[PDB]
Each structure stands twice: as structure tokens, then as C-alpha cells.
Scaffold this active site. Structure first.
Site, short mmCIF file in Angstrom:
data_model
loop_
_atom_site.label_atom_id
_atom_site.label_comp_id
_atom_site.label_asym_id
_atom_site.label_seq_id
_atom_site.Cartn_x
_atom_site.Cartn_y
_atom_site.Cartn_z
N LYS A 148 40.96 41.59 34.54
CA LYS A 148 41.72 42.26 35.58
C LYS A 148 41.19 43.68 35.76
O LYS A 148 40.17 44.07 35.19
CB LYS A 148 43.20 42.26 35.25
CG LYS A 148 43.87 40.92 35.38
CD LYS A 148 43.95 40.52 36.83
CE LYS A 148 44.68 39.23 37.00
NZ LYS A 148 44.69 38.83 38.42
N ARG A 185 47.06 44.65 39.00
CA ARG A 185 47.44 43.44 38.29
C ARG A 185 47.04 42.17 39.02
O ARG A 185 47.21 41.08 38.49
CB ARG A 185 48.94 43.42 38.05
CG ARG A 185 49.76 43.39 39.31
CD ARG A 185 51.23 43.46 38.97
NE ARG A 185 52.08 43.48 40.14
CZ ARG A 185 52.42 44.58 40.79
NH1 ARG A 185 51.98 45.75 40.37
NH2 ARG A 185 53.20 44.52 41.85
N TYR A 186 46.49 42.29 40.23
CA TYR A 186 46.13 41.17 41.08
C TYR A 186 44.64 40.93 41.13
O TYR A 186 44.18 39.79 41.01
CB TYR A 186 46.63 41.45 42.50
CG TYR A 186 48.11 41.33 42.67
CD1 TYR A 186 48.84 40.39 41.95
CD2 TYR A 186 48.80 42.20 43.49
CE1 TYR A 186 50.19 40.29 42.11
CE2 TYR A 186 50.14 42.11 43.64
CZ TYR A 186 50.83 41.16 42.95
OH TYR A 186 52.19 41.09 43.11
N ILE A 187 43.86 41.99 41.29
CA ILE A 187 42.46 41.90 41.64
C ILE A 187 41.60 41.97 40.39
O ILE A 187 42.02 42.47 39.34
CB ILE A 187 42.10 43.01 42.63
CG1 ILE A 187 42.54 44.35 42.07
CG2 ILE A 187 42.81 42.78 43.93
CD1 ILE A 187 42.13 45.51 42.91
#
Lengths: 75, 243, 81, 242, 394
Positions: free
Chosen positions: D175, D237-239
Site C-alpha cells: 500500500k 489506504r486504497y492505492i
DNA sequence: TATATATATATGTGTATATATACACACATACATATACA
DNA sequence: TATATGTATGTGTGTATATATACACATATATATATATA
């Protein structure tokens, strides 16, 4: 210098009797103006002399005083 | 003071807000009064007689203002107070937060537009990336018939912030809470779709008065987002407009 | 009407206003009247201010100076490897 | 009020070093003092160097030993007559005075001035502005302006070194916040986490008109577009990066 | 000069004493010719209506006195009174009793003192009060006189101390007056200050000091005015400030609002304002002896005075904040902050909130640090990250 | 004094959104302050 | 009555400094609100 005044000179010099003896801004000053058979109360946005209006007022209230004084009387 | 006391009483009565506090300036700033007559025993603050001097209780003890006049006055004043409550604080505003309207919202082809309601703003970044495939996707959607709005995280549930009042006419009514009324997300989505709380949307000429005629929830697939907040959204639309 | 990586912007003009644009936003030989109207040029203006090894500012005047300063470090690094 | 002793300050350690066995640590107040100290040593195999980033990183026995000696470590500012020119140079609206000053490094501090400061326990404002504020401004030039050899700043150089070290075994994705935790642990980064994660995000981006034409990383996820200037990426927290 | 004005109020007796040159201890010729006996100047000043040094007031005179009446009004409402005045060579004591009916002959001695003192007992019973004063009447009257003295202390010059019941009166600035009036409605609040100057004499000789607080919990507009020493309650100086602030407030409200249609007036503009205005204005007139209302042409201020724009801007900002708000910290106080031992106290301005956690941990070692500090003389506040600089913004 | 509401707080493990401040400089927008006059 | 002319604001980039907020879920406790008694 300590001076003693009489009523006459005092009333000509002093604003305590009738208000200011010159033109000042009188808040709420109103007058009645006729517009084609209709009376309107309009503001007067111009300085005027409170003491000058008071001398009219004093006589006028003397007259309405006499009216109340005599209203339950014969004359 | 007399007019104000009555005005405050009837304002709190007539208002179903029931919390706002107004004073004498609110009560009286729309009044012009003429008072003429005699009062025995008064005194003045100088020869000019600009100001009369008296104990206030003279009037509290001895005088009474006829109630018909007080009632008339209070009525006129509260009418203005409610007009200023419908205006001023609630005047003309603007669109809602993180909202992208479609080009055809509320128009002649209003019913064939979608609202892709997403969960946050990274999802709206994905949807903005994907609804702008210009010539690489001739069969896909774009902003001519699609919009975007964020659900703000987790939806508030309305199934336990609402109360039933069975009316004496027989037909029961359903009054919301002040917390549920003042949620920004739900106020935003009932502002976008043009919904109404006292319309059951049973026929079609009252469903044609929606600003665009479907909601599509674009949420995650973990159980926190597919099960929880999609279920709470379904519960909201069940509890208020099941039709 | 933009794509994900391609620009496509569409204006609309009120009628009989192109000639007012041409006579009102004047044309020099460095930029067009339509580009003067639609903000369609900018200057590539540089500020070549770097830090040097063993600390400290260094300020160059053109990119050739940066290239000619760069070359001997790589040369000596090949020699020592 | 600067004339008549109204502005005061504490004085805390920045680095404490703990010898094995002995019961007194060595306290350094400036970073270059510790670097010149630690380069002089020959065997630092049993010392524990503690960096105290903010003052809320101080343990309970340390704050007890700092609050037994509270009035021992408060200082007071004294105003000079040469101070008006230094307050106009460092914080005035004219930048060329600040270019002309800040070429040369910080003047080291003499022994008489050291003994006077530590003994009569007062500080001249000019002697503060020509050490602390000037050392800060040189540090900010080091952090915020690139080197002309590699082209990258201090943070991006730490990020490239930590990325070569992290993805060595296999080039498996991480992450952004997990890779940021890695490069803050192993590359000894001494600052906040939000700025490091923003630096990793903008080091991974690639769109027409981005800063980097040859990025260090391959970005996996939503990394923003031309339209909002790359300010429309995802949360960390996504990419992912690679 | 007058270096002090001592006022006292105790057991009903009221007293006031100043220390400039005394009233001339000399025979008044015309007053004696009228009285057919020997009359001195203090007796004229205290017992002769329409008499004083202001019968012929100048247009530039900023004394409140004008009528030659006030002192005799005090005497006429006194059961007993004592005028004492000394001019550096003689002292003069005269007793004036029974509502100016008994005027005792004065007593004149040598003295090298210089002062004027009026001391009297009012006719509280004739005026509606208990005899002697009740607990509530006494406390009310003491509070009111104390207030008037505080107002003097803000109006009077800087070499003059105002005492009430022998304590000095704290409030030498309009800011002090503003804080006093708003201590309850709005403690710890922001005080907008201005010195309103004029460019032409005589007005340029007399700047008006102004302090204003702006609060959402103020229900109506409110002012306190000391003009020429008079606590008057109505006058076009107030309207000058009101109208100026309103014009700016309307401009910036229509700017800041993107509604761009709503129309607010002076009541909306000003109902959250409390203003104190203190100073001298030459050439004013009143609506009666009480001097409740001063009389003036509004244009005096439009022509001659200017309100500093920084004050107007600050005020407009606070007011427009409240307007939009109506449409829709981190400070641990020390126990001895602002009291008798206020200068014994420190303010540990930390940088964030984790720093305050450290400092609050440290200042509570109660018996592990018996020689350390604590919250009896130490506060805390947050610097909020990085301070703004003022050198680039002034 | 009683029976009865409707709103209100706190705990752990979860779901989502944010904002001031420093630092330099090319560029954009807002007057406004005069100076010929008119 | 147009003109300049010197004022004042105002976002914007990278690398720093310090913070803020909504929601779900169960159950025990709470503090004021409410009938109707009278």
C-alpha cells in the site's frame, strides 16, 4: 469670573429651557404635507431649532390646557 | 411588553420548531402605534417635556389592554415572524456538497437519468475516471444522463429515530426526529431527487415530478459496505416511500 | 466534454460578438486575438537554482551549464568502479 | 517587553545517548553537534541513541528529571540595538537581503558567549537569529530544493533508497501507508507521516502534465488526472505502488 | 492642576473633594448689593440660582457645566450640607441647611491648603427612600455612584486619580469600561478599539476614545457614553458610529453572501454591538438640565471626524460572521491569572495538543516534585502549529 | 406525589470526511489617485 | 471624463509544523420532561 444672571438673559443663552438655541439634528422630526386632498406625515431631514419649535408648542399646550380645564364647565 | 409576552406565547405555539427565542425587538420592530389621552400624576424630565416619568406598576395595577386588540396584533406580528422564518434564515441557497449534476436533470428527459450515489470521494474519483471514457467507450454512460453524490460514510438509520402518532381522524402520521431532520447527507439526497414526505408516489404523474428517476448505489463489496449501508439505504426508502 | 486524458472544451457565444472580440482584443504578431480572448499561451520562464554536493545553493544560467557540470562526476565514477 | 524580560523559553534535549552501565546520559541540543560527536567514535556498538522529535516523546523518568530542574532550564531574551536589521532581513518582505545573507553557513559559537549564556542565563536576540533561524533556513533549502546531479530532493532520495531495499526479494505490491512505514523505519525519516505519504503519491503519478516524466514507481489504483491537477487521487489506504 | 477627585458615600452622607485651585474666597459685589449683606463667591456658587462661571460659555468649551444651577440643586435636596474651600491662603467653611432655607454665615481662617469639598445629607425620605437607607437602597446607591466614578476615571486626564470610598477607581480606559460592562454577557471577549480624530480645531483638540464588543448573545444595541463628563444616553455621536458601521456591514454582507438579494438594516447591523464612547465634544447643547441628550448637527461628524478603517473592518468582520451564523480553546487557566498575584504567573505556550499532554503530566507531580511548578501560577495555551508573521502583513 | 413519555451519554471495533500555518515568485484581479482636463 | 499610477489582495508549487469530524453496534444509567390527580 462668577456671574449672576436673571431669567431673561439666562433663557436667551441657555438650552435647558426649550432645547438648543440653534439648528441641530432633531431625530424623528416630522411635518404634515398636503398631497391632493391627502395629509401625509413625512420626515423633515433638515436641522431645525428645538427652542423655535418649543415656543409654538408652549402656546399650543397652554390652549389645550385651557380646553381640558373648561370641558366640564359652563363656558 | 404586553404585546411581546403574547407574541412569544403564540410564536412558540404556532412554531413546531419549539426552540427559537425572540425578544422585544423581534416582537415590536414591525409596529407603529399612536397613543393619545390623559394620564394623571405624571412628571417630566425637564421643561421641554420630552419624557414623562412614572412608576411602571401604575399600568400593571390599574390599566388593562383589551384582549381583542392584543390578539389582532399578535396575529399580524406572528404572521410576519413566520414569513421571516420561511425567509431570512431559509432564503435562496446553492447545490449540495460533493455533488455533480447531470446535464439532463429535471428537464424533458428527466426520467432517463441516473444518480450514481457513491460512498466517499475516492469512489467519485473512480466514477469521474470512468464516466469520461470519451471515444474509447461508445456504449458506456457519461454525464449526459448520470450524476454523482457521496453517502458520507455510513447512513443514519431512520427506523429508530422516528415516531408514530395515530391521529384522531384515524390516519396515523409519522414524525421524524430533529437529529434525523438535520442530517446533511439525507437532506442533500432529498434535495437532489426532489422527494416529498407527504407524497406516497403511487400514480405516475406524481412520480414524474422527481428530478431524475432512479438511484444507483455504487458501494463496495466487503460486508461493511454491501451489507450494512446498502441495507440502511433500503431501510430508509422502505420506511418512507415503499411504492 | 473532456476525456480522461484529452481536452475538449466548448464555449457558446451570444450572437454578433465575434467582430467585437476581433476589434476589442487586439492582435499582435506574438499572440492571436482568439488566444488573447481565451488565455491560450504562457511563458516558459525558468529559475535554475539547485543545491550542490557538500551543501549549499548554486545558481545556473542555462541548461548547458547543468549538463557540463554533470559530466565529470559520472566519468570519475566509472573510473573508480 | 523584549527589553524588560517578558519573552522566555525552555531548553530541552534533542538527542540523548545512553551508555551501557553508567547512569547518566549524554544530551545533545543540535543535530550537527551529535554528528561531529558520533563520527569521532570508533565503537558505537553498545550505545542507544534516542531522537526526540517532539517534546511529547519523552518518557516518565525523563520528564521527572526534566521537571525537577525546571527553573534551572528556563532562559530569557534580551534585546540588542543591532537586532532591528536582523529582524528585517529574516522576516521582511525583501528577498534579496535573504539571498545575500544565506550563502555562507552558520557562524560557530564562541567560548565566552557560551559561558555567558549558560551562566547569567540570558539570550541576545541577534545571537539567536544568527544561529537558530539561519540554521533552519539552510535546512529548509536542503529539504525543498533539488540536487543538480540526481534531480531529486532529500525525501525522494530516501524514498528511492527504501524502495530499492523493500522490493528486492519480489516485486510484490504494497500500500502507500505500509511502504511509507517501511521507508520511515529503515531510512531514519524524522518527520510526519502525512507529508511522506503525499510525497510517495506524487512520486508515483503519471499523466499528461505531471511533474515526473520518468517516475520511480508504477502506480496501481486511482492516481489522479490532468483535470484537477493530480489533486484527485485516492486515500493512501486504497492505492498501491510498485 | 486637579490631581484627585475623592468621592465617598457612607451612612447616607455623600462627599466629593478635588484639589485644584479652590473657589475664590472673595466678596461678590453684585450679590452683596442684592442681599444687602456680605456675600462671598462660594455662597453665590452654591446658593444663587443661575449663577456660575459658565453663564457665558465659549463655543470651544468642553465643560459639562453651563446653567449655574446644578450645585444649588444639590443644596436644595440636602437636609444639611457643608461647602469647604481653600485657595492656599484662606480656608472657607459654610453650612447650608434645610433645603437652602438656612444659609449660615461662613467662617474664614488662614490655611495654606487648596481644594474644594461638598459634603451633604440628602432628603432620602422626601425623595421616596427609607430613613435611614435600607440594605437594598444603600447597596443600589453605592453601586450606582461607584459606576459614575469609574466613568469619571475613564474621562478624566492622566494626572488625576478618581477615588470612591478611598479606593482608587480602576477603569482609566474605555477598554476597562467595556470589559466591566460585558464581564457577564461576554467574558474573555474581543475589544475593538478606535481613537476617532478630527482635522479642524476645535474638534481636533478632542479625540473620541471608543471600545466595542460584538457578541451573538447581545440582544439589542447598547452604548455607554461619557461626553464632557456627562453620562448622557442619547446623542448623534452614537448615530454617527451606528450609520458608519452599518454602511460597511451592508457592503460586506452583500459581498460575502452569494444570495446577493437580502436587505438588512441598522437593527440587524448593530443589535450585537456594545460600544463605549468617551471624550469631549466642543459646542454641544442639551435638551434640559439633566443633560440626558446632547444636541448637535449630524454633519459635524460627517465633515470633521473620521472613524479609523481598521476598527470599522474588525467590527464589520465580527458582525457579518454573526449574520451568517444566525442564518444557519485549548487554554488551561491558571488559578491566579489576573488577580493580586498575577505578575507571579507564567504562560507555557505549547505548540500542539500532545505537548499540552506532556506539560499537564509534568505540572501535576504533586509530591514527586515538591520544588516544581503547578497550576497555581502556570497556564497553558496552544500556538496552533506555525505562527503567522506580521512583518509581511502590516 | 405521582405514572408516563421523549431525547441523551459511554464503551471497542469498525465505516467515511477534513484544515490552518511557513517558504518564493510570476501572474491575476481590484481600486484609486492623481492630472490633463472636461 | 478618460487616463495611468501607485497602492493593495490572491491562489499556487514542495516540504515542513500543529490539529479537526460524521457513522454502526448493546445496555446500563441519567437529567430533566411530562399527564392527570386534585
Amino acid at each position: 469670573a462668577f456671574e449672576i444672571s436673571d431669567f431673561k438673559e439666562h433663557a436667551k443663552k441657555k438650552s435647558m429651557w426649550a432645547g438648543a438655541l440653534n439648528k441641530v439634528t432633531i431625530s424623528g422630526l416630522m411635518g404634515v404635507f398636503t398631497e391632493d386632498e391627502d395629509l401625509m406625515a413625512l420626515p423633515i431631514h433638515r436641522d431645525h431649532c428645538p427652542a423655535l419649535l418649543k415656543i409654538f408648542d408652549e402656546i399650543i399646550v397652554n390652549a389645550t390646557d385651557h380646553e381640558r380645564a373648561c370641558h366640564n364647565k359652563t363656558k | 411588553k404586553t404585546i411581546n409576552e403574547m407574541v412569544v406565547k403564540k410564536f412558540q405555539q404556532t412554531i413546531k420548531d419549539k426552540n427559537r427565542k425572540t425578544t422585544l425587538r423581534d416582537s415590536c420592530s414591525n409596529i407603529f402605534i399612536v397613543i393619545v389621552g390623559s394620564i394623571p400624576g405624571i412628571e417630566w424630565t425637564g421643561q421641554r417635556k420630552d419624557e414623562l416619568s412614572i412608576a411602571e406598576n401604575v399600568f400593571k395595577t390599574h390599566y388593562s389592554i383589551p384582549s381583542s386588540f392584543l390578539t389582532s396584533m399578535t396575529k399580524s406580528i406572528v404572521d410576519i415572524l413566520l414569513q421571516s422564518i420561511s425567509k431570512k434564515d431559509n432564503h435562496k441557497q446553492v447545490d449540495v456538497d460533493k455533488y455533480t449534476r447531470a446535464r439532463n436533470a429535471g428537464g424533458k428527459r428527466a426520467q432517463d437519468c441516473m444518480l450514481l450515489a457513491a460512498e466517499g470521494d475516492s469512489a467519485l474519483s473512480l466514477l469521474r475516471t470512468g464516466l469520461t471514457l470519451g471515444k474509447s467507450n461508445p456504449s458506456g454512460p457519461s454525464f449526459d444522463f448520470c450524476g454523482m453524490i457521496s453517502l458520507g460514510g455510513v447512513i443514519m438509520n431512520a427506523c429508530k429515530k422516528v415516531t408514530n402518532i395515530t391521529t384522531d381522524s384515524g390516519e396515523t402520521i409519522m414524525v421524524r426526529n430533529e437529529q434525523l431532520t438535520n442530517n446533511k447527507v439525507l437532506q442533500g439526497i432529498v434535495q437532489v431527487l426532489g422527494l416529498d414526505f407527504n407524497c406516497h408516489y403511487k400514480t405516475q404523474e406524481e412520480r414524474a415530478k422527481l428530478r431524475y428517476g432512479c438511484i444507483v448505489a455504487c458501494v463496495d463489496q466487503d460486508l461493511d459496505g454491501c451489507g450494512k449501508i446498502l441495507g440502511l439505504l433500503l431501510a430508509y426508502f422502505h420506511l418512507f416511500w415503499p411504492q | 466534454y473532456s476525456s480522461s486524458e484529452t481536452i475538449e472544451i466548448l464555449v457558446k457565444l451570444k450572437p454578433n460578438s465575434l467582430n467585437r472580440i476581433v476589434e476589442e482584443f487586439k492582435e499582435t504578431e506574438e499572440q492571436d486575438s482568439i488566444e488573447n480572448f481565451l488565455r491560450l499561451r504562457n511563458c516558459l520562464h525558468s529559475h535554475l537554482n539547485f543545491v550542490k554536493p557538500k551543501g549549499g545553493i548554486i545558481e545556473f544560467n542555462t541548461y548547458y551549464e547543468i549538463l557540463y557540470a554533470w559530466l565529470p562526476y559520472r566519468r570519475e565514477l566509472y573510473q573508480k568502479r | 517587553l523584549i527589553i524588560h524580560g517578558f519573552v522566555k523559553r525552555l531548553l530541552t534535549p534533542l538527542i540523548r545517548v545512553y551508555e551501557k552501565g553508567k547512569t547518566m546520559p549524554v544530551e545533545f541540543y543540535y543535530e550537527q553537534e551529535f554528528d561531529a560527536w558520533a563520527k569521532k567514535q570508533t565503537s558505537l556498538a553498545n550505545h542507544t541513541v534516542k531522537y526526540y522529535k517532539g517534546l511529547a516523546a519523552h518518557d516518565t523518568h525523563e520528564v521527572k528529571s526534566m521537571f525537577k530542574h525546571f527553573d534551572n532550564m528556563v532562559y530569557t531574551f534580551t534585546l540588542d540595538d543591532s537586532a532591528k536589521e536582523l529582524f528585517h532581513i529574516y522576516f521582511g518582505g525583501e528577498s534579496e537581503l535573504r539571498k545575500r545573507e544565506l550563502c555562507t553557513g552558520v557562524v560557530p559559537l564562541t567560548e565566552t558567549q557560551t559561558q555567558s549564556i549558560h551562566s547569567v542565563r540570558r539570550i541576545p536576540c541577534s545571537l539567536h537569529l544568527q544561529v537558530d533561524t539561519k540554521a533552519y533556513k539552510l535546512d529548509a533549502i536542503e529539504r525543498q530544493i533539488p540536487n543538480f546531479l540526481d534531480g531529486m530532493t532529500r525525501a525522494r532520495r530516501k524514498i528511492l533508497a527504501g524502495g530499492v531495499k523493500c522490493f528486492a526479494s519480489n516485486n510484490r505490491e504494497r500500500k502507500v501507508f505500509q511502504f511509507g512505514g517501511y521507508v520511515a523505519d529503515h531510512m531514519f525519516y524524522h518527520h510526519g507521516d502525512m507529508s511522506l505519504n503525499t510525497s510517495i503519491i506524487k512520486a508515483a503519478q503519471y499523466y499528461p502534465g505531471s511533474s515526473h516524466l520518468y517516475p520511480v514507481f508504477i502506480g496501481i489504483g486511482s492516481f489522479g488526472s490532468r483535470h484537477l491537477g493530480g489533486k484527485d487521487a485516492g486515500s493512501p489506504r486504497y492505492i498501491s505502488v510498485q | 492642576k486637579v490631581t484627585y477627585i475623592k468621592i465617598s458615600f457612607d451612612k447616607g452622607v455623600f462627599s466629593c473633594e478635588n484639589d485644584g485651585p479652590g473657589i475664590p474666597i472673595a466678596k461678590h459685589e453684585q450679590a452683596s448689593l442684592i442681599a444687602k449683606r456680605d456675600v462671598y463667591v462660594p455662597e453665590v456658587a452654591s446658593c444663587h440660582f443661575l449663577a456660575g462661571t459658565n453663564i457665558n460659555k465659549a463655543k470651544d468649551c468642553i465643560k459639562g457645566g453651563t446653567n449655574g444651577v446644578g450645585l444649588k440643586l444639590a443644596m436644595v435636596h440636602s437636609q444639611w450640607a457643608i461647602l469647604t474651600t481653600a485657595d492656599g491662603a484662606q480656608k472657607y467653611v459654610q453650612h447650608i441647611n434645610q433645603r437652602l432655607d438656612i444659609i449660615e454665615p461662613p467662617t474664614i481662617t488662614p490655611s495654606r491648603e487648596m481644594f474644594t469639598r461638598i459634603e451633604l445629607m440628602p432628603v432620602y425620605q422626601e425623595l421616596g427612600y427609607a430613613e435611614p437607607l435600607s440594605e437594598t437602597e444603600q447597596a443600589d446607591l453605592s453601586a450606582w455612584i461607584y459606576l459614575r466614578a469609574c466613568q469619571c476615571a475613564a474621562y478624566v486626564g492622566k494626572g488625576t486619580t478618581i477615588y470612591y470610598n478611598d479606593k482608587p477607581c480602576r477603569t482609566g480606559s474605555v477598554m476597562a469600561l467595556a470589559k466591566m460592562y460585558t464581564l457577564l454577557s461576554a467574558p474573555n471577549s474581543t475589544i475593538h478599539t478606535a481613537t476617532i480624530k478630527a482635522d479642524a480645531k476645535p474638534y481636533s483638540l478632542h479625540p473620541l476614545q471608543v471600545a466595542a464588543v460584538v457578541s451573538p448573545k447581545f440582544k439589542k444595541f447598547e452604548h455607554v457614553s461619557v461626553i464632557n463628563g456627562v453620562n448622557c444616553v442619547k446623542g448623534e455621536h452614537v448615530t454617527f458610529l451606528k450609520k458608519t458601521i452599518n454602511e460597511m456591514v451592508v457592503k460586506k454582507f452583500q459581498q460575502t453572501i452569494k444570495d446577493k438579494n437580502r436587505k438588512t438594516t441598522l437593527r440587524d447591523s448593530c443589535s450585537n454591538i456594545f460600544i463605549v464612547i468617551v471624550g469631549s465634544i466642543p459646542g454641544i447643547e442639551w435638551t434640559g438640565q439633566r443633560k440626558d441628550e446632547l444636541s448637535i448637527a449630524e454633519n459635524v461628524f460627517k465633515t470633521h471626524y473620521s472613524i479609523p478603517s481598521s476598527f470599522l473592518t474588525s467590527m464589520t468582520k465580527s458582525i457579518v460572521d454573526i449574520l451568517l451564523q444566525s442564518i444557519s480553546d485549548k487554554y488551561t487557566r491558571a488559578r491566579n491569572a489576573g488577580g493580586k498575584r498575577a505578575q507571579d504567573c507564567m504562560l507555557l505556550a505549547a505548540e500542539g495538543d500532545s505537548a499540552l499532554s506532556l506539560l499537564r503530566t509534568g505540572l501535576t507531580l504533586g509530591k514527586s516534585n515538591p520544588s516544581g511548578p503547578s497550576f497555581d501560577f502556570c497556564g497553558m495555551i496552544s500556538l496552533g502549529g506555525v505562527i503567522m508573521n506580521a512583518c509581511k502583513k502590516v
